Design a protein around this ligand. Structure first.
Ligand SMILES: Nc1ncnc2c1ncn2[C@H]1C[C@H](O)[C@@H](COP(=O)(O)OP(=O)(O)OP(=O)(O)O)O1
Ligand SMILES: [Ca+2]
Ligand SMILES: [Ca+2]
Length: 1105
DNA sequence: TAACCGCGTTC
DNA sequence: TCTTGAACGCGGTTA
């Protein structure tokens, strides 16, 4: 049956792979000893593994196996196949009768079963597993994965009535072979992952394919250089509209192959033959493009296809190729009578992405979305090239794409080529090293390593460890459709996450003094701890000993005297040191310190830790719940009766009906409560999980430290050596990229235990990680409060100021002449966290043969310092007593922007006016020589921006006004999925649809460019919202919609200037100028620097005193 | 006024 | 199907 298609597909894939240079290599037969240490002697072919896919194979029903795609040492390529029987396990609730269920499944599954076997694995949910006791399991093996699925289909009936009550007719009678099946296990492992794990094969490693299997050649390590292609397609476009692969044609396709550029053009659209040209944005990105002017598109497609066949690419990179370019070329190939999969072996898959068997499709957009660590407002190719490649790509407005086909083809070709350059070199210097290296530890191919969620990446890593330690995988987690608490249905339940505080606002600068009030008892405490904390820094922070340090006492006495000056003069007006302290990999290091794992949470090996639980429940109670349901049982349903509907479909009707009843009587739709819960953490459980976290943390620390090394080397580089300065700066962005790309995967080991379908779910374990972190950040803040003035706090980071005279940086001197770095403000914190948050109960197996553990003290929680900074600027809220958190600006000593966070300037969309405003104002806080002077200097910029708005934009030209006044906002789903909701995006989506057709809203992720109107008057802002595109429409079209939209049937004036509700914009900017300058200025004792923006009444009253 | 939502950041 | 988490700002509706 269904095998038919699979066997057919393989023959196809086999022929296309053969066409592209991968043909099955069957290694010679060897009757000599199979050790890895004789690899040179064993006959076989050595190659670099670049790809792997599951296949069926008819012998030399189909047989399951994995094709492996190799690049050989001699410049060629080949594939080799590994067969491996797929398998899962049957768990038994009576291990004395495994025999009987064994003989039962043997008969019952005769149709699909191949072989059967009794095994044993470690089960962390079984008592006495730490003493060597193991769970007995039946290993069912199959010829192919269809047979495996078939057995699952036959077992679940048994699995599902065993859960249901058995019906015994002889009521007067007080166990069957089928009821002994408790569960099946490891039944949902992707086959190629299973082969990849059980066989320890990884893409990116070198092997020698031999008769007895694959032998890793540890003597190579350096990756082979594959043939890499990257392409961009530019197409024709209806004015003010989206390209349609049904109507529109490809104008031109630009690509690059191992550094050499090319360019196809359809002369029917392009209207001019083009000639070889060069686009080399920077020396390190050479771009010589040869051009292939073609007559009809059909020839453009054939020529693109032809090349590919000649080049034999193993990697094809694009930029959003999965959802536009690849599909587009498909529809056009179909329309023009070409089958692309016969032409180049590419075709869409189940999720609609485009893959091939031999060549990986490397969509840079997927990397950027997951691993670039950039905001989504910075993930467009223009901005990515600036951040990561250090140059400005060529910018051409999409509306002018289609006409510039004729007016200036050569210009449009330059832009086409600019997209290709940026895509190839973005892939080659960021994606390709990261993904292929990742494959050497993660059992996926490049295509999957690029696209899988970071949680799944964590899961893959964890499954390797669990298998290699012979640990049985738990089945995927299943959230209950209904959960309750004190008789109330739970809308949602979670834990209290990170702790965040805004404590101050305003301007803080290295040349502008502040008041400090130092707690004298704080100085006493530090001095009591100074000797042991200094030893701590040397012994633990720098892994040395007090014996080889020679200036210990001077540094001590130096520190001691500065501290003593601060104890007497506790009231001081000094220049500040703007510092930031942040725990390195906080949550991971908290899990490793406390030996935290989902499997360590139990109900002395026991380390009791607290977390905070938070639930959201209906104030309704069981009585109300029981009633509403019966009501619902009586309605007829669209399709039916309520009981007829799926349990899920039932409860979702219930939830919508509960929200209404509770509001009527309870009057509150939901109730929030925080319960503190204590969980047991067994300090002796098999540590395979946390060890995986430990390993991946250390993997990241590798790159974070190299970033820090080269950030130091650039300081040593002399200003004149531009090449050196440039390379180091290039190394810094390289390692910052690599270390950030690991950060998300790393922290996903913490997320994973709350993820849906998690094989290792524990709400407790995540809760305890968060609450511990809240305790550590707050004890740190308590001390800096007593000795300085903290500014913002966020989970693990503290921005604070300190008196210039607070002990700062000191350098120990060693017997070796070497020096040890010491930041006193850092090590004073690090000593107290290590004295109050150390796990003295950490246990590990010392002797596995007799199960002897040693108990022990662990702690890897360290603050790290960056600073001192030149300026920090915190906004304040418009509301009394409140602050803005997760938003601020920081500046380095040289005047460069250190960090900008949270602000609209960084986010995607937002109103461009506030973007450009923020872009201009922040840097201005560096001027003036007094705080009052500084606010003045920024006030000048504010009034200038206030001027353009009070002038009703008569001040700057039209094409420049549309940008400043537009607000772009993306829309997660299609508008059809938003009804019952009102927003400026939702309106702009309808009006785009009405005027430009329903096609506009068919695809989600729409980006709604809108200005809001003055009319209708007193109408809600959501309703007075106009797509920008209308103002580029023909005058009759504009008038009809605008008058309709403004609700004035007689409006003749059709100028953007008249319609704009400049009032909205002034309020918006004012709130901006208010929170960033005016209100903050007051909290710093400065009378309103922008008097045209009025204060709030509460501030006026406190200003009034 | 306060609760609640979608989006997109900071952790 | 496949799928890391919680805390937060902001403009906007809604009770
Ligand atoms: N994307 C994320 N997913 C899950 N947890 C996260 C994420 N980002 C941050 N966290 C959590 C876990 C981190 O330990 C904690 C502190 O945030 P942050 O300081 O940005 O990261 P970090 O402390 O792990 O790395 P770093 O060494 O760069 O400080 O916040
Ligand atoms: Ca393009
Ligand atoms: Ca951190």
């Amino acid at each position: 049956a269904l095998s038919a298609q699979q066997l057919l597909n393989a023959s196809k894939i086999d022929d296309i792979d053969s066409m592209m240079g991968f043909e099955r290599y069957v290694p010679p037969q060897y009757n000599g000893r199979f050790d890895a240490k004789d690899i040179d002697q064993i006959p076989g072919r050595v190659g670099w593994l670049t790809n792997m896919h599951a296949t069926l194979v008819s012998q030399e029903q189909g047989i399951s196996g994995v094709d492996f795609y190799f690049l050989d040492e001699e410049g060629g390529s080949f594939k080799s196949t590994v067969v491996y029987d797929p398998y899962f396990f049957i768990a038994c609730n009576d291990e004395s009768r495994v025999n009987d269920v064994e003989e039962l499944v043997k008969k019952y599954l005769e149709s699909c079963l191949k072989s059967l076997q009794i095994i044993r694995k470690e089960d962390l949910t079984m008592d006495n597993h730490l003493l060597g006791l193991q769970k007995t399991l039946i290993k069912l093996s199959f010829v192919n994965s269809n047979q495996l699925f078939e057995a699952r289909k036959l077992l679940r009936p048994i699995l599902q009535d065993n859960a249901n009550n058995n019906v015994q007719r002889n009521i007067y009678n007080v166990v069957d072979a089928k009821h002994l099946i408790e569960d099946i296990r490891e039944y949902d492992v992707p086959y190629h992952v299973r082969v990849s794990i059980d066989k320890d094969i990884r893409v990116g490693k070198w092997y020698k394919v031999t008769q007895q299997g694959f032998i890793e050649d540890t003597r190579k390590i350096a990756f082979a250089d594959p043939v890499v292609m990257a392409f961009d397609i530019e197409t024709t476009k209806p004015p003010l509209k989206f390209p349609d692969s049904a109507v529109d044609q490809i104008m031109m396709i630009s690509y690059m192959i191992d550094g050499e550029g090319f360019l196809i053009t359809n002369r029917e659209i392009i209207s001019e033959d083009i000639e070889d040209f060069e686009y080399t944005p920077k020396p390190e990105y050479p771009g010589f493009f040869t051009i292939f002017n073609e007559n009809d598109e059909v020839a453009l497609l054939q020529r693109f296809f032809e090349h590919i066949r000649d080049v034999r690419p193993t990697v094809i990179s694009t930029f959003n190729g999965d959802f536009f370019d690849w599909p587009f070329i498909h529809n056009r190939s179909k329309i023009h009578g070409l089958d692309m999969f016969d032409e180049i072996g590419f075709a869409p898959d189940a999720e609609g992405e485009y893959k091939s068997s031999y060549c990986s499709h490397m969509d840079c957009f997927r990397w950027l979305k997951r691993d670039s660590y950039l905001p989504q407002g910075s993930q467009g190719l223009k901005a990515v090239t600036q951040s990561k490649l250090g140059y400005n790509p060529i910018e051409l407005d999409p509306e002018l794409m289609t006409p510039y086909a004729f007016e200036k083809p050569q210009h449009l070709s330059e832009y086409s080529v600019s997209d290709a350059v940026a895509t190839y070199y973005l892939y080659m210097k960021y994606v390709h090293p990261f993904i292929f290296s990742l494959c050497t530890i993660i059992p996926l191919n490049p295509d999957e390593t690029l696209r899988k969620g970071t949680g799944t990446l964590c899961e893959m890593l964890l499954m390797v460890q669990a298998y290699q330690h012979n640990i049985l995988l738990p089945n995927k987690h299943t959230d209950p459709i209904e959960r309750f608490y004190d008789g109330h249905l739970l809308e949602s339940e979670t834990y209290v996450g990170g702790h965040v505080e805004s404590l101050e606002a305003g301007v803080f600068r290295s040349d502008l003094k502040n008041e400090f009030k130092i707690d004298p008892s704080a100085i006493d405490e530090l001095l009591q701890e100074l000797p042991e904390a200094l030893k701590f820094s040397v012994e633990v922070e720098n892994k040395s000993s007090v014996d080889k340090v020679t200036n210990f006492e001077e540094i001590k006495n130096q520190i001691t005297q500065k501290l003593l000056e601060l104890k007497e003069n506790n009231i001081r007006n000094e220049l500040p040191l703007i510092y930031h302290v942040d725990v390195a990999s906080m949550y991971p290091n908290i899990m490793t310190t406390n030996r935290l794992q989902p499997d360590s949470i139990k109900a002395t090996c026991a380390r009791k830790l607290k977390w905070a639980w938070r639930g959201e429940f209906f104030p309704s109670k069981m009585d109300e719940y029981n009633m509403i349901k019966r009501a619902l049982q009586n309605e007829t349903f669209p399709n039916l009766t309520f009981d007829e509907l799926s349990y899920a479909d039932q409860v979702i009707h219930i939830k919508k009906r509960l929200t209404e009843y509770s509001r009527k009587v309870y009057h509150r739709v939901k109730v929030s409560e925080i319960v503190e819960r204590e969980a047991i953490v067994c300090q002796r459980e098999n540590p395979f999980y946390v060890d995986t976290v430990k390993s991946f943390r250390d993997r990241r620390y590798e790159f974070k430290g190299l970033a820090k090394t080269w950030k130091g080397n650039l300081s040593k580089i002399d200003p004149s050596d531009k090449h050196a300065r440039d390379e180091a700066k290039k190394m810094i962005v390289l390692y910052d990229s690599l270390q950030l790309a690991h950060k998300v995967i790393l922290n996903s080991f913490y997320g994973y235990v709350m993820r849906k379908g998690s094989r290792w779910y524990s709400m407790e374990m995540a809760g305890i990680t968060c609450l511990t972190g809240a305790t550590i950040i707050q004890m740190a803040r308590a001390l800096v409060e007593r000795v300085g003035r903290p500014l913002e706090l966020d989970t693990d980071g503290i921005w604070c100021i300190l008196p210039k005279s607070f002990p700062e940086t000191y350098f120990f001197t060693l017997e070796n002449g070497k020096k040890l770095y010491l930041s006193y403000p850092c090590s004073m914190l690090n000593y107290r966290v290590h004295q109050k948050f150390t796990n003295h109960q950490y246990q590990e197996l010392k002797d596995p043969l007799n199960y002897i553990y040693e108990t022990h003290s662990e702690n890897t929680i360290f603050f790290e310092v960056d600073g001192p900074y030149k300026a920090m600027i915190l906004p304040s809220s418009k509301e009394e007593g409140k602050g803005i958190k997760k938003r601020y600006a920081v500046f380095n000593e040289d005047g460069s922007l250190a960090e900008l966070k949270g602000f609209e300037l960084k986010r995607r969309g937002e109103l461009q006016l506030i973007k450009n405003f923020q872009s201009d104002i922040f840097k201005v806080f560096l001027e003036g020589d007094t705080l009052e002077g500084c606010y003045s200097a920024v006030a000048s910029v504010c009034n200038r921006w206030l001027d353009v708005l009070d002038s009703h934009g008569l001040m700057l030209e039209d094409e420049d006004l549309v940008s400043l006044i537009c607000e772009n906002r993306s829309m997660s789903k299609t508008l059809k999925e938003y009804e019952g909701q009102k927003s400026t995006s939702i309106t702009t989506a309808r009006r785009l649809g009405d005027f430009l057709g329903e096609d506009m809203v068919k695809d989600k992720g729409l980006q709604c460019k809108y200005i809001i109107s003055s009319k209708p008057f007193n109408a809600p802002v959501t309703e007075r919202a106009i797509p920008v595109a209308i103002f580029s429409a023909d005058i009759p079209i504009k008038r009809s919609f605008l008058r309709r939209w403004t609700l004035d049937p007689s409006l003749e004036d059709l100028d953007i200037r008249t319609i704009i509700d400049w009032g909205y914009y002034r309020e918006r900017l004012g709130s901006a100028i208010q929170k960033i300058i005016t209100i903050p200025a007051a909290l710093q004792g400065v009378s309103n620097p922008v008097p045209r923006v009025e204060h709030p009444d509460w501030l006026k009253r406190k200003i009034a005193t």
